Structure formats: structure tokens, C-alpha cells
Write a protein that binds this ligand. Structure first.
Ligand SMILES: NC(=[NH2+])NCCC[C@H](N)C(=O)O
Ligand SMILES: NC(=[NH2+])NCCC[C@H](N)C(=O)O
Ligand SMILES: N[C@@H](CCC(=O)O)C(=O)O
Ligand SMILES: N[C@@H](CCC(=O)O)C(=O)O
Ligand SMILES: [Cl-]
Ligand SMILES: [Cl-]
Lengths: 677, 697
């Protein structure tokens, strides 16, 4: 069964969980008045999950969650991205400025308070009652100036059930989170392209951090005098192994789902948001791939990586529409609540569904742009955020250092991808409808966008401080580069403002519709959409049947890595040390009882983007794995959980330990984790 | 699941084991030299396939891709049998196929002593004749005598076995009136043509149907309007009750070629030269050719068989190389040669180590020559059809003043031009990108000095392969049929003698013959050493328990219906269904298009009595039998010798089975006879064929 359950809903799920073999009490998982698993389950860097596993604040999350921190610490000497990183003491752990981890201190229902504040906003705009920015801004009104005021704390208020409930999360915000360990990328992201969203999977997707705190255990900014955070509760690691049918529990921070989409919303989300994305990324991939198949990657692998991650997802979603009859399932569900309302003489529900249809039909062309603009150029062309004058000198200097940084590259992406992202965007979106005429003067979108390189001072690093001697203001003000930037940004804000006339009634009607779903279903029985707050899902360890003749098992092994090895294909390179371990069968206590070395497994838990790094626990609440992905067949799970295809893809905790111990020899961390055999 | 493509004479050695796996046949039921047996119904089709006789009126089942040549030849845009299939509702509607031959084994005879006797007569031999089919055939008339060797509908085939340590003669009845009866649309006969080729799971209705015709007296015969169906003494009964995992399966047919006695150095050479070069050049050809086919239905027809054949060998080379890597095939053959060498050493025998060394030396010696041969063959001879251009003979060059011999020389040119500029040939696809793409790469791989003269000189004179090919088509009289005929109204001796396409064909042929002459210096010692090596393997293992390499003669193999584990986490079942066709359906992908009628049947579950017991509709199954190319169309029989399927492929993981059979990875891929009947019945509604086949429930 699917559902991303509120921590407050554990009491409604615990009986079913125990019938599936769970041996925890509800209070063990979430305790409003004490220590529980809620305290060990962590948000990492805004969009990932992590788990605390020691009394010294040791933190496990995915490799791909800690990737940039790993990268930032890498040079040719000390190449942690390629070779992995291992610290042998507290003092060796690496500082990560800007990295934040959050822990839920308390969850409170603020629905009534939020409502009675949301009433009569002067000129109630379109989307206040859904905006996380405006909602969390109400925290001083709810809890007084010990909100925001308190340095290591943050009050998160979000809408649930389309805004029919509001829950407040009291976060402890740690700003001293240090890098402890990482496997090499050949393990951390084995098969990163071909195997992304794929089961079977053979990826050692983990990294290790540690929460530091001040001398009395309060979350603090970085200081040389900080000590390890000593958590209330951490999760004990169980290294005894897993088998098909074992109960599994996942807690984490699922990002976004759309389980209350109506039929018309499903179709739009497909034929607009989905396929506009697939070939706009289909094109932003081949030109990107052609360009540096020929050249020596760290220049643009992180580029091709994220495009692909979202690219393949979109293909998975599209498969569910075509094969899993997603639209008709959502249509059936809304017809069921419609019939429920009709029977009760309720009129708002059909009105709600009709207004949703109306807003979707009407915003069709505007949404077309805003997503065509969002990744045709907005993330597909890097200097759409070139600096702009305040001169009306002190911070075009202090801003260009953020434009041309340690990741950014003027050098190339010129008319291989820059011209290519501009593409024939303008064919699908008439030049009538493009931002503030250039494609009409310099000829093409290439001879326009490449003309900027010579003319703009914001092309090189040399030219910036070449004429740092004086104010060429008549030249600084009229630069096409910061014109193209403010331009694409101009229409972005205008579209946000213009389509708001559709988004506002949509949100009102969705709220109305979901209220009806709420009156129909038990609120305690209905899981809300994911919204980047702490949820639990449960299931069992289980493969599936992907297609005629074929069965996928629930557990993968090191043999599967060796079957995939290909020295000539970057993604399938196998570390010589890992191969020697395989050839020697040097697995120790970490092997399966049958003698194979476990790598990944999969489960019928309901996860989504944001669950990377979530702890997977057994019937006793002990750690058995870390979530890092979902199969492409289960992508449609964001709209309707798909029990016979959807599987979370999970790192077997024994493989993580094996990598620490046998591969890296970092005994220090085994001693700290204290795995149970 | 043991390997081995057993001789018919080896049936006595295997029958006990076959029975232990559940067979309920006696040896003599399968192969009987003193009367009739299943052998009599197992047919060689078009020289390179198998077929099976299934009625008393000569009805013949084989694969779609085996009948593909004939289907293609009968197809036009107007009557597109490739695309839409073909179905005949009477004898008179069955299509005539000139040149198509089918052969039946009447007798098998050991002629080892008589061939060796004849070989010893050769004063100063090349060293190539004892494996030369041209030579071995020339011996038959002495062996069998002038009478009976001049018997019209018979052929006496002598082949080398065990590297030339045995010779067997196969007396063949040759049928030269074989008519096309039925074929499914390609969307069924070759569903997933490229992507599913060499793959399990498989969902392909790979069959076609023919009929043997004969004269007045039921004798094999050349085509005649007066011919009638041939009435075989034996035909295989068809069982439509279905199959299950674990069932015994027997396959008989004509496996073409295996290399089970390759030494490790031979494995490496085959992989790094023959296969790599095949993959490289055929990849280039296919990219251009398919593009052309998908853009024009007439081109699609013209080049359908050429493409399918090219793609088939291309992907087979990919699979063999992948097998060698993933399954350590080189290491296995090394271990096998070490075992025969240790056996030799124990017995004080020195000939074996000497043979293994002579094999390695010859392989190392011929590297440059063999790579040049493969590039020429794959790059030019197989895919540039210019290489069959006409060339003027010596009557043109030296007898032009003789009106008689001049006319003969002109007719020879015309005869060549018809063969070259055939109905399947498009000068447009040749000259636009195809010949240039191939020749450009060929020129990059083969040094100028080692290229055919015309090509070297042509590329030096004009800028490039591109400019050179463009010149050829600009200047050649054979560029088009219209230019050819305009020229032949007033022939010029010069230009005819100097024609650039002629010079290209001449130069390529000269280099081909040149390479063969020079490489014989290595190939002859290599063959002699192979003979010595296999002779030791024979001394070690004994002939009765050692299956020889395939050589396109009748063999049996047996095993059970069984899936396998291709890789970690994954298990493949033994049987595929129609649902898997529907899962693969994609209107925008040419190879996964699904016929609307087939989909209607599936949605209506209209399967008659052909369904599985669980209500699914069967499509294919796989078995642990040991097959290879040539076994396409082979009857797959159950424990009682009844037909339950037709072999048509081998799985990906099993492609390397020509080097080493691997019981945990190699599976024959088989058309379930129930799907074949379903397609004839529910899909085509060709009732008369169901009636004739008489499936047993
Ligand atoms: N591009 C990648 N392979 N990223 C790592 C895996 C991410 C995973 N598909 C989630 O989302
Ligand atoms: N090109 C093809 N798909 N041919 C049909 C299948 C032939 C099979 N791979 C044997 O050999
Ligand atoms: N890979 C996703 C997790 C997908 C899932 O668990 O469904 C992430 O980075 O958060
Ligand atoms: N497809 C092959 C048969 C391959 C096999 O059975 O191993 C052929 O056309 O003969
Ligand atoms: Cl286990
Ligand atoms: Cl499902």
C-alpha cells in the first residue's frame, strides 16, 4: 500500500504495520513528548534525507546528496571525487560552509491559527495560503519572538491537503556539518547514467557526515571549538542481513507528489510539463553529449547529470500514462468523490472539478511558455544571471565572482549548447512571445548569442579587471549580456504575475476538491501529498515482474557489479581494489549467508524525490539500508502509487559497512557505528 | 543440457541418455539406415536453412527469415508480401520459386578411406584440397560411379569432419520445384527485427510455409506446370497440446559452422579480426541502408533481405565478442587445449604440442593478410554492389573487328549488366552515401599501398573516396539503365575498356584473388595442424562420444524446455506470450508495430484451442538444445517425435556457443507450434492449411 504518512498518523497505521511484522510501538517511531526515531531522521542540505547512527552525531546520507561537498574538497592531489575520502579522526573531518542539516524538534497543528491570520489579507493575492515563504513568516504571530530570534532554530509552516490543514515544524538548524567519508565515484555512482532509475541496481550510493554543535550541544555556526553533536536518539545499525518479505520502514522528506490530481490535471502535466521537458532535455543532452564525448567532463558532467536525472524521470512518468492507465485511474477517483458529493446534495465538489478544468484549459498557452522558458534557456543557459548595476561599483565586482565561479565556464558551451538551448525554441514560441528582437537583427540565435562573447565585458576573467581603472558606465549600463539576463528574467516575473490569474482559482478549487476528498475519506486514513516534510512509509522487501518472461529478484550482489564492468565506459569502471576483494571473496561477516556479497535491495515502500538518503529500518527499528532511488516504472507513483511495479531502490547497509571496512580500512567508523551481528 | 551436434550415426551413443531425460523414441525412429525414420522428413532449405515436412502432400514449415528471400522476390509496392504477408487458398495459388532447392538425405555413408586414397594420389598438393568442397565434390563420381552420379534429381555431397580426420557422403534427393504457400506479415514474422534479434525473451512468429512439388511419378523435378504435390514417405505429426518447463526436446537440422576445437589463439584472432571488422564495417552499411529503407517503401523492399542478412551477422559478431568477454571463452578453450596436451604428454606423444605451435605460428603469420581480407570482404565485396560491375572480356579487347566475337563480347556485357543492375539494386542508394561511407573507412584502415589499384589511384587523383565514387557514377556507362542502353545502340570499344566502374570491380577482384593466393601460405599449414590437433582430441575422447563441428550436414541435438538466469537479480522463464507483444507495441517504432488484427484477437482473447492452460496465448519458448546458424527452421519435437515447435534463433548469452556450449546460458529460441497455428487460423483464416497440417489435441 502506498501513502507518505504524517508522523501524527502513526497511531492509525501501527496496527496494520504490526500485522506486516513490525515489532515497534507507535511511540517508538514518533513521540510528541519524548525521544523517538523522529529525532534521528534528518533533512540534509534542503532536499535530501539523512540518518543519525551514533551518539557522536555521525550522519549517513547518499553519495549523490553529498556530491558537491565532496567535489569542493577535491584537487588533482587529494582527488576525493575519483578516489573517495576517509577521515581517521575528528580533526580530519572537513568543514562545509553553507551546508545545513535540520532536525524536527516538534510538530504542531496550526491550522486554526494560520486560518485566522490568513483571513482578510489586504487584497488577497493568488497564492498566499500555499506559499511557504508567507506561511513561515507568520511564526512570530504563532509562537512569539522566540521564533527567528532563536539562532539555532527555524519555524517551518506549510500547507497540507491543498491547504485544508497547516502543520508547523520546529527545526533545529545545524550549520556545522562536516564531511567524514565517501566512497570513490566508481562505487558511489556506478552506472550513473544507464542505471539511473533502474532496478536491478548495483550502486554504493552513500556519503558520511557529522553534526557538530557548541559546547552545550546547541546547533551553531562553524567554530574551531565545536564538538560532536550528541543526539537524543540515533539509529542502531543491524548487519545481520535481509530477506524477501521482510518488513521495511522508511522515514524521510519526500518532496512533491500529486495524488489529488484530477483527470484534466494529469493530461496537462503530461502533454505540457512532461513532454515539453523530455525533448527540450532530449535536445539539451545530445548537443551536450556530442560536445564532450570528443573532449576530456568535470567541465560539464554535472550539467548532463541533472538534465538526465529529470530527463529519465519524465520518460518514466510518460510510460505510466501510456501503460498504467494513470489518467483513467485519477478520473475514476474523482468520479467516486463526485458521486459521493452528489448523493449528499453537495454542489461545491463538481464546481471545484469544473473550475480546475477551466483554469487548466485557460492557462494552456501561458504554462507552455513558463516551462519552455524555464529550461529552454533559464537553466539551460548559464549566464542568464550575469551581474547588474547598483551604481545609482562595490558589488558588480562582488557579484561577478558568483557568475564566473569555480564551476562556471565562459570558455566553452558556446554555440555547442548556448546556441542549442536557444534552439528553435522560437519556433514553438513565436518571437512575438519571446523576452525583450535580437534574433531579428543578428540573424540567428547563434549569431546573436555568440556576438555577446566579444561585446560583453562579462565574458572573460581577464577583461573584468582589464579596465577596472574606470567607470565605462555608458558601456556598463547597455551590455547585451546583462540585458539578455534581465530580459529572460523580465518575462519570467511577468509570466508568474500573468498566469497567477489562473493559478489562484486553481488553488482555491483544488482546496475545495481536496476538502471533499477529506470529508469523504478519514483524515486519519488519508495521506497528504509530499511537501518536503517528515513522513514515514512502510512495505516489504520484494522484487517484481517488469514484463513478460521476466522476474526481478529483491536483492543484488557484487557479482552484478563485475558482470557490468567495462573499463572503456566511464560509468561502469570498477575500482581495482573492489575487484580484488571480489576475486578473493574477502567479505567477512558482511556476505549473505549463501556467500554472495550484498549490494542493493528493493522494497514496496512509497518514496519520491527528496527521499534520497532516507533510513530503511527493520521490524525492530534498526538500520538495514539507505534509500537512494525509485525504478522508472514507479515514477508514476507521484500521481498514483503503483503496487506491482513501484519499488524503492536501497543500499544494503552491509555493503556500506563492507566499503568502510574491507575497501577503505577506516576501522574508526566501524567502531563508532557498532554494527550488530 | 550437454552440448554436441551429434551425427546421425551417433544416435546409438546418445539414446540411453535421451531416454533418461524422458525421450520415448528408439534410436531407429530417429535415424534408420535400413528403413524410414524422422530423418526423412528433415529437410535442407535453400542451402543454408532447415525445414520440416508436415503432411502427405509435401507441406514444408521453415522460418519467416528462411523464406524471406522468396517473399522479398515476390514482393512489390503493389503486392507487398513482406509487409502484409501472403496466403494461398489453393494449389494453383502457391507461388513458383526459380532456383530454390530443397534437399532430403537419402543415405549417409562413411567414405573416409576412399577420400584419403584419392588425396594421396596428389603429387605436390596445395594443402587446401582435403577441406576444399570443390575438390571433395569432384571425388563423388568415382566413389558412386558414373551411372547414378548422372541421376537427374540426386546430389552426392562429401564433407570433411573432425578437421579432415573423417569424411562422410550424403546422398541427397534434390527438389527444384518448391513453392511458396504462406507467410505472416513481417510485423509478426520479424517482430522486433533488430532489437530482439539474438534475444530472449522473444515474441516473434518466425515461420513461412512452402510445398515440395514433383513429377508424374512422385520424383524430384525441375519446375513444370504439370507438377503435382510430392507425397513424402514420412512427415512429422504436429502436436498442439502445448509444452511445459522440463519437457524433453529433440531438434534435428543442418547446423552450419562451429569452432569447438579452436585453440585460445584462434579465439582471439576470430574476435579481434573477423568479428571486430565485421561489426565496424557492417555498422556503417546498416546506418545508411536502414535510413534509406525507412524513407521509401520501394527501397525498403529492394534492400530488405540484404539489410536483414547484414544486421544478423553484425549483431551475431557483437554477441560472440560479448560472450568471449563475459564468459571467459578464451580461458575455457585454453584449459581444454592444456588438457589434451597433458594427455599427450602422459602418453609420450609429441605431435600435439607441435600442432598447437603450428596453429599459433600460422595465426600470427597471417594477421596482416587476414585483416586485409576482412576489410575487403566486409567493406567492399559484401556491401558495395559496384564490385559486381560488368567488365569487358578479351573478345572486346582483342577481337572487336570480328563481328561474331564482338557481338559475343557485347552480349557478355549485357549478361553482366543484368546480374549487376538487378531489380534489388538502386544506383541512388549506392552513390548517395553508402559506397562512399564504406570506401572512406576502408581507405582509412588499409594503407594506400595495400589498397586495390583503382581505389589507391582514384583517391590520389580525385580528392577522396567521395570525389572518386562521384566520378565513377558521373562517367560510367553502367550508372543507369537508360545510359547503358543509350550507349549500347552505338558501342565504343574504348570507354568500354576504360570504364571506371569496370576498373573498380576488376581491381577489387584482383586484390581479393591476390590476398587468397598469398594467405594460402599460412592457411594450409594451419589446416594441417588443426587436423593433427583434432586427431589427438579424437584419440583422447574417442569418436563415438565426440560430436564434430557443424559443417552444414544433418545433426541432432536434445535438451529440455528451460529458462535461465542471464545476470544478477534477473530470471527468464521458458515461455513467452502474446501479452509480451502488446507490452512491446510502439506505432512509431518500425520494428515494434503491431498488426491491428493481432491486437483485436488479443483484446478479444480469441485463441480457440491454442491457448495455454492458464488462458494466456503462447508465442515462443526456449530449450537447452545446442543449435547454430543453419538450424533455423529445424523441427523441435517432443518425447514422441511429434512437432511442438520450430527453432529460429539462439539467445544473446548463448551466441558464443559456436566456441563453447554453456549449459547455464545457452538456449535455442523456438516458435511455439500453437502460435503458428493460431496465426494461420485466427489471424489469417487460411483454413485449408490447418486442415492439411492436422494438429493433434
Ligand atoms: N543522475 C544521477 N544518477 N543521480 C543519482 C540518482 C538520483 C535518483 N534518480 C533520484 O532522483
Ligand atoms: N535479421 C534478423 N532479425 N533475422 C532473423 C533472425 C535470425 C537469427 N538471429 C538467426 O541467425
Ligand atoms: N533519487 C531521488 C529519490 C527517489 C525516490 O526515492 O523515489 C532523490 O534524490 O531524492
Ligand atoms: N538464426 C539462426 C539460428 C541460430 C540458432 O539456432 O542458434 C539461423 O538463421 O540459422
Ligand atoms: Cl541475508
Ligand atoms: Cl501497479
Amino acid at each position: 500500500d502506498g501513502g507518505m504518512w504524517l508522523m501524527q498518523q502513526i497511531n492509525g497505521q501501527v496496527a496494520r504495520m504490526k500485522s506486516l511484522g513490525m515489532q515497534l510501538e507507535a511511540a517508538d517511531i514518533y513521540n510528541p513528548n519524548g525521544s523517538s526515531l523522529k529525532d534521528a531522521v534528518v533533512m540534509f542540505d534542503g532536499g535530501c534525507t539523512g540518518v543519525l547512527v551514533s551518539n557522536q552525531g555521525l550522519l549517513l546520507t547518499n553519495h549523490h546528496c553529498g556530491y558537491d561537498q565532496i567535489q569542493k574538497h577535491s584537487s588533482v592531489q587529494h582527488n576525493y571525487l575519483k578516489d573517495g575520502f576517509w577521515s581517521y579522526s575528528l580533526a580530519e573531518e572537513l568543514v562545509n560552509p553553507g551546508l545545513e542539516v535540520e532536525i524536527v524538534d516538534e510538530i504542531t497543528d496550526v491550522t486554526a491559527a494560520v486560518k485566522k491570520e490568513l483571513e482578510r489579507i489586504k487584497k488577497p493575492s493568488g497564492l498566499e495560503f500555499l506559499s511557504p515563504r508567507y506561511l513561515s513568516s507568520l511564526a512570530p504571530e504563532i509562537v512569539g519572538k522566540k521564533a527567528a530570534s532563536r539562532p539555532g532554530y527555524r519555524y517551518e509552516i506549510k500547507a497540507f491537503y491543498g491547504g485544508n490543514r497547516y502543520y508547523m515544524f520546529t527545526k533545529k538548524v545545524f550549520r556545522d556539518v562536516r564531511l567524514v567519508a565517501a566512497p570513490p565515484s566508481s562505487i558511489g555512482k556506478f552506472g550513473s547514467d544507464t542505471d539511473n532509475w533502474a532496478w536491478p541496481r548495483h550502486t554504493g550510493d552513500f556519503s558520511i557526515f557529522r553534526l557538530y554543535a557548541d559546547k552545550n550541544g546547541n546547533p551553531a555556526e562553524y567554530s574551531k571549538d565545536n564538538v560532536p553533536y550528541r543526539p537524543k536518539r540515533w539509529v542502531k545499525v543491524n548487519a545481520q542481513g535481509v530477506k524477501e518479505g521482510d518488513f521495511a520502514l522508511i522515514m524521510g522528506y519526500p518532496g512533491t507528489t500529486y495524488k489529488f490530481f484530477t483527470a484534466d490535471e494529469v493530461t496537462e502535466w503530461s502533454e505540457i510539463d512532461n513532454n515539453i521537458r523530455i525533448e527540450m532535455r532530449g535536445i539539451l543532452q545530445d548537443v551536450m553529449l556530442r560536445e564532450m564525448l570528443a573532449d576530456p567532463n568535470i567541465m560539464y558532467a554535472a550539467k548532463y547529470a541533472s538534465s538526465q536525472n529529470g530527463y529519465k524521470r519524465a520518460q518514466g512518468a510518460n510510460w505510466a500514462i501510456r501503460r498504467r492507465s494513470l489518467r483513467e485511474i485519477k478520473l475514476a477517483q474523482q468520479q467516486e468523490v463526485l458521486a459521493w458529493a452528489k448523493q449528499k446534495g453537495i454542489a461545491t465538489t463538481e464546481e471545484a472539478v469544473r473550475a480546475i478544468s477551466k483554469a487548466i484549459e485557460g492557462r494552456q498557452d501561458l504554462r507552455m511558455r513558463q516551462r519552455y522558458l524555464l529550461e529552454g534557456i533559464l537553466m539551460g543557459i548559464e549566464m542568464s544571471n550575469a551581474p547588474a548595476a547598483d551604481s545609482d561599483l562595490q558589488s558588480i565586482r562582488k557579484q561577478f565572482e558568483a557568475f564566473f565561479n569555480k564551476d562556471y565556464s565562459p570558455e566553452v558551451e558556446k554555440d555547442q549548447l548556448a546556441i542549442a538551448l536557444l534552439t528553435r525554441y522560437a519556433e514553438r514560441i513565436p518571437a512575438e512571445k519571446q523576452p525583450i528582437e535580437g534574433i531579428a537583427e543578428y540573424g540567428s540565435a547563434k549569431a546573436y548569442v555568440e556576438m555577446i562573447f566579444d561585446k560583453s565585458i562579462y565574458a572573460s576573467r581577464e577583461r573584468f579587471e582589464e579596465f577596472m581603472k574606470n567607470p565605462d558606465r555608458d558601456r556598463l549600463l547597455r551590455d547585451p549580456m546583462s540585458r539578455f539576463a534581465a530580459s529572460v528574467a523580465y518575462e519570467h516575473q511577468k509570466l508568474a504575475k500573468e498566469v497567477a490569474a489562473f493559478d489562484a482559482p486553481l488553488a482555491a478549487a483544488q482546496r475545495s476538491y481536496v476538502a471533499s476528498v477529506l470529508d469523504m475519506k478519514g483524515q486519519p486514513n488519508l495521506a497528504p501529498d509530499a511537501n518536503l516534510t517528515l513522513r514515514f512509509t512502510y512495505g516489504e522487501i520484494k522484487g517484481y515482474q517488469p514484463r513478460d518472461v521476466v522476474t526481478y529478484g529483491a536483492k543484488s550482489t557484487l557479482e552484478g557489479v563485475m558482470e557490468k564492468e567495462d573499463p572503456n565506459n566511464w560509468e561502469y569502471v570498477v575500482d581495482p581494489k573492489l575487484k580484488a576483494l571480489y576475486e578473493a571473496k574477502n567479505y567477512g561477516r558482511y556476505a549473505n549467508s549463501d556467500g554472495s556479497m550484498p549490494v542493493n535491495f528493493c522494497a514496496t515502500t512509497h518514496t519520491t524525490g527528496g527521499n534520497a538518503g532516507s533510513p530503511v529500518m527493520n521490524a525492530r527499528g534498526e538500520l538495514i539500508g539507505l534509500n537512494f532511488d525509485r525504478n522508472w516504472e514507479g515514477v508514476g507513483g507521484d500521481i498514483e502509487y503503483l503496487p506491482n511495479y513501484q519499488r524503492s531502490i536501497i543500499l544494503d547497509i552491509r555493503y556500506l559497512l563492507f566499503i568502510i571496512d574491507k575497501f577503505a580500512g577506516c576501522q574508526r567508523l566501524i567502531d563508532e557505528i557498532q554494527p550488530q551481528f
